[PDB]
Design a protein around this nucleic acid. Structure first.
Ligand SMILES: [Mg+2]
Ligand SMILES: [Mg+2]
Ligand SMILES: [Mg+2]
Ligand SMILES: [Mg+2]
Ligand SMILES: [Mg+2]
Ligand SMILES: [Mg+2]
Ligand SMILES: [Mg+2]
Ligand SMILES: [Mg+2]
Ligand SMILES: [Mg+2]
Ligand SMILES: [Mg+2]
Ligand SMILES: [Mg+2]
Ligand SMILES: [Zn+2]
Lengths: 94, 37, 50, 120, 148, 177, 49, 101, 86, 94
RNA sequence: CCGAGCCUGGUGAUAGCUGGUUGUCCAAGAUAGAAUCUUAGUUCAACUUUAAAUUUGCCCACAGAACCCAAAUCCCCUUGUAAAUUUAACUGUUAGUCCAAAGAGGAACAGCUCUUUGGACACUAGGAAAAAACCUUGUAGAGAGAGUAAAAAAUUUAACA
């Protein structure tokens, strides 16, 4: 006795969830810190025209750095030392 | 299901929390307006 | 009804939080809510809702 | 259906009571936002999560600095609900080259240029 | 696995820390081969490092047999009589050095689960809790509902 | 400390005989305190493996009182095991037939549902009246207080309290009472 | 360590509980009057820099 | 992580200290110190000059092999690995207090 | 616990965040010698240094952009002066 | 020696008698034993606390299964604190 | 053991169908559709993968995008960021479930069916009772350290001159 049809949380009839002062407090907290965010997002410092073309140089140079990092691609160098170090497996005392 | 239904369509839990937060809190004085005034 | 929605002590209102999308509730909600703030749910009507 | 949520500009118009409450002077406004991610970028749309990732807030509870300009304001207005904001406050002026190492943040948005690590 | 493997309480041998500390690694015994590519690291180790190791640690004694071995071994005998064997087969000189050093630093007793990371012979001061610590007494020591 | 090992261990893990008078108290609160004191949670040396429980005694279980209409609304239900053996009895008839059953069932529900529940319930002791056998009113320690304080009746309110309490209104003389 | 002291050093734990209770009473006095009063003696805090 | 210690007692640390065996060490951070009849609480920690906690290092030892397996059913997801973290064993030699207070 | 109180007082919500309980050295030689820094404190100092450097860079870029705007506007004024002079 | 307590290393008999002799030598009254607290006197696990009081002055108190074990253990405690071998004593310096 | 015998051989018949598919460790990775005697499949596309060449790629700011009879979208220099396009080579997925929203069908029935925008699942973890799809939360270890996230339903009801 006391069951509900089908799955518990979906369909035309489901288990009725209810709210608690716990969750209400939590979400009022979220939205009041969101209102503080609204306030601090207001009152900007500069305008579009003031902030238009100041960081273009930095963006450009960073992008050329990325370009150089991508272009600088080769196999690594090969060395006679790395080749002949393998002979040292048959080392033995006289 | 559909939006418009004969029955009251059970809503999302966040929506129900929102509706539980938003109500008409009537402005009441600290003193009842009959006994004192 | 209008003096109630003017005198409500609750600082938070459906219309405010929905127009602002303060918690991503635009997911759960409809576009119609933005006019049918709280009073309506499908066809029904909650006059006590504000 | 669910799409981008355009916000009216009237929301971003601080009132006098909001000014005297939050302590933010509109004249001589702050320059830098300390931003911190609170909620999970999961269960959120792809544009929200990629905005978070481009701002550099993939890591939670790690304050990250941005400017106060409209081009950034747009992004963190799209992702308000995932973050908390504060302005940057410093009494000791910008950190000089000698005090690059002895810097420290505070929960109050303050950034102290010198950190003696010893009480009064 | 903990329930499969045995356990022990944390403890030091013969109370080594209080008085003069002693390097509790008594003896080492290397078994290396003249030939064998596996023993090349061990051979270079006994060539160059082991001298410095002995100069640094006099309390320990080292033996080297230098006989044919397909796998070079290192044995460590401790004060308790604990034997600790390791195979240095195909091992680098730096890794051999780290192994020998961690053996010198290790104590002569098994590595198994430790129930608790501490050990206090005198754990209690002010007297440990008993039921009658934090409750008062009665006039003439009278039980509840007692006339005389 | 300066106590020997075995005696100190004994004194630490010893059992204690608590006593309670259930004269007009709620079986719920009584059972909560009894359950914690039977687990041994009140002992800072508690661990489920170490049976640090304590013996507890209740008296005047007959003269207990619910909060609300529990006496008739509450139902204790049990199935004998046979068809039609589903029996339901109000707290009223259940108390009239056995005044201890209410408190013991409340404590049995309060306790954890492990195999130590039965042992702790055995260590528990209950008495309908203020009468106790010699041994188990002798080997006691102390009586912990009650959960609720009972209010006074007009039979108990002394005269000076009534005089201190001010009269609130003046009746008209022309009225019957 | 709180539990360890509750077991093996009950007197120190009683001292700590007494301190906590005194701080509660100071906080209650503050709830009555927030400012306009001398701050509590133990409620006072140490600031580092 | 916190501990409560006395003299002639051992302590285990689940990391390396870079201190050879047998060396001594002065521990600074103390949240309190207590005797039979009194204690000294910090705000948060005590003064340097008041206390002096000295310990000796006795052993560096590799932990027993701790196994880490991840398995998921009906997905052919199985992966094991073994970890051995170092430990440093210390013994608290002496605890003393200064008259300054 | 007490995170809100610590924040109201200005301290970290989690005491492990910053302060003398974590930033100070955990051990030193009995001879009185200073111990080597721990990796945690080292990386914290490094990231704080990068943080301050970034703050300085951002502020300098903002100031330079504002000054460039002001210069462009006063040049606009000067060139209108030139226009009506011609 | 630091690990083992003293009565583990030094066996004795009639500790109460040795205590009485010591106190007589120290010129104080012969103390009397009195159970301070008790629990489960009737059940199989009796517990008693016996304190030794001289001239209405307590030197030591000890727990015990029975009154005899409690009083002998209390005499042991008194001997410990008299001879200065309490577990809470100054450890051996170096 | 005859809708047409048994044996051998072709024959390792063929099977878009079912089952099965052997040591360890790491990383990236579920994704629009068209055609098909085609819908239990395959080919192309899309997504995904590897190595290389190059530079623009993503969010986007004013302006800009129809007469007929809404939420948003396209384009987009800035800005914050670091990805993107192309070249060489295959594979696999191409039988999809729930929630919210705009709708169509049906009974304004379905855990129903069909398109679109988004999220989750098909990957670990905490809660809601156990629970796929709901709410918090992601990048991986040891701790006998700590601060937090979502997280527990409230209701009692009718006198009358
Ligand atoms: Mg079901
Ligand atoms: Mg629908
Ligand atoms: Mg046939
Ligand atoms: Mg991977
Ligand atoms: Mg066609
Ligand atoms: Mg097919
Ligand atoms: Mg563009
Ligand atoms: Mg369906
Ligand atoms: Mg379906
Ligand atoms: Mg599949
Ligand atoms: Mg992590
Ligand atoms: Zn009134």
């Amino acid at each position: 006795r006391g069951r509900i049809p089908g799955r518990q949380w979906i369909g035309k009839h489901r288990r009725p969830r209810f709210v608690s002062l716990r969750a209400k407090q939590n979400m009022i907290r979220r939205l009041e810190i969101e209102a503080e965010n609204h306030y601090w997002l207001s009152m900007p410092y500069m305008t579009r025209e003031q902030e238009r073309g100041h960081a273009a140089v930095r963006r450009r140079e960073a992008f050329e750095a990325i370009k150089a990092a991508a272009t600088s691609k080769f196999p690594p160098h090969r060395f006679i030392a790395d080749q002949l170090d393998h002979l040292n497996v048959t080392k033995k005392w006289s | 299901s559909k939006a418009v239904t004969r029955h009251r369509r059970v809503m999302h839990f966040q929506r129900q929390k929102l509706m539980a937060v938003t109500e008409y809190i009537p402005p009441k004085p600290a003193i009842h307006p009959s006994c004192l005034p | 009804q209008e003096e109630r929605e003017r005198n409500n002590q609750n600082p938070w209102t459906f219309e405010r939080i929905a127009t602002a999308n303060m918690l991503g509730i635009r997911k759960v909600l409809s576009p119609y809510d933005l006019t049918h703030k709280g009073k309506y749910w499908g066809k029904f009507y909650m006059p006590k809702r504000v | 259906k669910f799409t981008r949520s355009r916000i009216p500009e009237k929301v971003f118009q601080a009132s006098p009571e909001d000014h005297e409450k939050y302590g933010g002077d509109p004249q001589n406004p702050h320059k830098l936002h300390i931003v911190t991610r609170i909620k999970s970028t999961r269960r959120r749309p792809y544009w929200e999560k990629d905005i978070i990732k481009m701002l550099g807030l993939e890591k939670a509870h790690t304050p990250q600095v941005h400017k106060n300009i409209p081009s950034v304001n747009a992004k963190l207005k799209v992702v308000k609900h995932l973050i908390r904001i504060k302005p940057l406050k410093l009494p000791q002026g910008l950190p000089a080259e000698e005090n690059m190492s002895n810097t420290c943040l505070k929960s109050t948005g303050e950034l102290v240029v010198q950190w003696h690590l010893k009480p009064v | 696995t903990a329930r499969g493997t045995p356990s022990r309480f944390l403890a030091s041998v013969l109370h080594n820390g209080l008085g003069r500390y002693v390097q509790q690694l008594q003896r080492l015994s290397f078994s290396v081969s003249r030939d064998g590519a596996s023993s090349r690291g061990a051979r270079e180790f006994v060539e160059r490092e082991v001298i410095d190791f002995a100069r640094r640690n006099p309390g320990v004694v080292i033996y080297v047999n230098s006989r044919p071995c397909c796998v070079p071994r290192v044995v460590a005998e401790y004060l308790n009589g604990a034997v600790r064997e390791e195979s240095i087969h195909c091992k680098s000189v730096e890794e051999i050095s780290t192994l020998v050093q961690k053996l010198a630093d290790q104590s002569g007793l098994d590595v198994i689960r430790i129930r608790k990371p501490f050990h206090t012979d005198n754990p209690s001061i002010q007297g440990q809790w008993h039921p009658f610590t934090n409750k008062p007494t009665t006039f003439r020591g009278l039980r509840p509902r007692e006339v005389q | 400390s300066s106590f020997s090992r075995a005696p100190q261990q004994w004194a630490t893990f010893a059992r204690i005989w608590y006593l309670l008078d259930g004269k007009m108290q709620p079986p719920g609160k009584l059972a909560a305190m009894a359950s914690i004191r039977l687990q041994g949670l009140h002992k800072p040396v508690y661990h489920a493996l170490s049976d640090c429980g304590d013996h507890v005694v209740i008296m005047n279980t007959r003269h207990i009182a619910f909060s609300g209409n529990k006496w008739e609304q509450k139902v204790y239900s049990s199935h004998t095991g046979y068809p039609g053996g589903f029996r339901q009895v109000t707290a009223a008839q259940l108390h009239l037939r056995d005044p201890v059953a209410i408190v013991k069932l409340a404590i049995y529900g309060m306790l954890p549902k492990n195999l130590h529940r039965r042992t702790m319930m055995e260590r528990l002791h209950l008495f309908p009246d203020e009468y106790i056998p010699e041994d188990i009113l002798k080997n006691l320690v102390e009586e912990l207080p009650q959960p609720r304080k009972i209010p006074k009746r007009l039979d108990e309110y002394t005269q000076e309290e009534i005089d201190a309490f001010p009269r609130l209104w003046t009746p008209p003389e022309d009225y019957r009472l | 360590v709180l539990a360890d002291l509750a077991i093996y050093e009950p007197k120190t734990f009683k001292s700590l509980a007494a301190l906590a209770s005194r701080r509660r009473h100071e906080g209650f006095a503050a709830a009555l009057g927030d400012g306009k009063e001398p701050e509590g003696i133990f409620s006072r805090v140490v600031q580092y820099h | 992580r916190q501990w409560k210690v006395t003299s002639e007692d051992l302590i285990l640390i689940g990391n390396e200290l870079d201190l050879a065996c047998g060396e001594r060490i002065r521990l600074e951070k103390v949240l309190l110190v207590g005797a039979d009849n009194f204690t000294l609480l910090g705000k948060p920690l005590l003064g340097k000059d008041l206390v002096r906690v000295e310990a000796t290092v006795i052993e560096k030892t590799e932990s027993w092999p701790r196994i880490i397996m991840r398995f998921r059913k009906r997905k052919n997801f199985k992966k094991k690995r073994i970890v051995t973290t170092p430990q440093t064993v210390l013994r608290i030699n002496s605890i003393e207090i200064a008259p300054c207070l | 616990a007490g995170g809100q109180w610590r924040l109201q007082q200005g301290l970290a919500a989690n005491p492990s965040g910053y302060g003398p309980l974590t930033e100070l050295p955990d051990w030193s030689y009995a001879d009185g010698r200073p111990a080597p820094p721990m990796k945690g404190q080292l990386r914290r100092k490094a990231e704080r240094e990068t943080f301050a450097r970034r703050v300085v860079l951002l502020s300098q870029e903002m100031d330079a952009g504002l000054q460039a705007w002001q210069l462009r506007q006063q040049k606009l004024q000067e060139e209108q002066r030139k226009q009506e002079n011609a | 020696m630091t690990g083992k307590e003293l009565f583990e290393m030094w066996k004795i008999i009639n500790p109460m008698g040795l205590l009485v002799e010591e106190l007589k030598k120290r010129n104080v009254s012969a103390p009397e034993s009195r159970l301070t607290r008790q629990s489960g006197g009737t059940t199989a696990l009796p517990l008693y606390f016996v304190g030794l009081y001289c001239d209405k002055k307590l030197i030591a108190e000890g727990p015990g299964e029975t009154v005899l074990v409690a009083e002998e253990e209390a005499a042991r405690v008194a001997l410990r604190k008299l001879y200065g071998f309490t577990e809470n004593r100054r450890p051996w310096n170096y």
